[PDB]
């Protein structure tokens, strides 16, 4: 399952980067070019969403009242619910990832030994498992990169 592997990596690295504030220097490995452009696209638009919706995000983080790194059950139900209307687009996808990073940041403050892993896995699981065929049709992360490609 390469789609899942690649997705978990891009999403995990971004969240970890956001939480620790430190970039990771490791070869992405497989389809590395796409993954890096994805991470780059993800930095640009991802940070933008958090900046531009700081007020809404702060409120959402507050109602989520996430207790620990493992308490991702509620967020999982939230994300599933977001797509429950049958609408699928990159805007929603990147917004969920951006909020994921926003949550990952808050987790650090309360304890610094928090793997962002459980959070990244919860997000990746929803996207790749419930939107499997939609992603494949979009050429996966190249579609992501392409959609958010600005001139």
């Amino acid at each position: 399952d390469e789609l899942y592997r690649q997705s978990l990596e891009i999403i995990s690295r971004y969240l970890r980067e956001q939480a620790t504030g430190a970039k990771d220097t490791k070869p992405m490995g497989r389809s590395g070019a796409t993954s890096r452009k994805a991470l780059e696209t993800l930095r640009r638009v991802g940070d933008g969403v958090q900046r531009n919706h700081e007020t809404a995000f702060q409120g959402m983080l507050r109602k989520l009242d996430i207790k620990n790194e493992d308490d991702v059950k509620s967020l999982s139900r939230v994300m599933i619910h977001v797509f429950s209307d049958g609408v699928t687009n990159w805007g929603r996808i990147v917004t969920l990832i951006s909020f994921g990073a926003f949550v990952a940041k808050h987790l650090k403050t309360i304890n610094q030994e928090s793997c962002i892993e459980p959070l990244a896995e919860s997000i990746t699981d929803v996207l790749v498992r419930t939107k499997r065929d939609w992603l494949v049709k979009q050429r996966g992360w190249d579609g992501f990169v392409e959609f958010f490609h600005v001139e």
Binding site: V45, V49, D65, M79, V82, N89, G91, T95
Partner: peptide, 22 residues
């Protein structure tokens, strides 16, 4: 109820972001 509100925000923001880049 809180989770429904959270879903509403993410969806509103998601579609708004989608339109912008679209």
């Amino acid at each position: 109820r809180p989770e429904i509100w959270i879903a509403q925000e993410l969806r509103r923001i998601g579609d708004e972001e989608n339109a912008y880049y679209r």
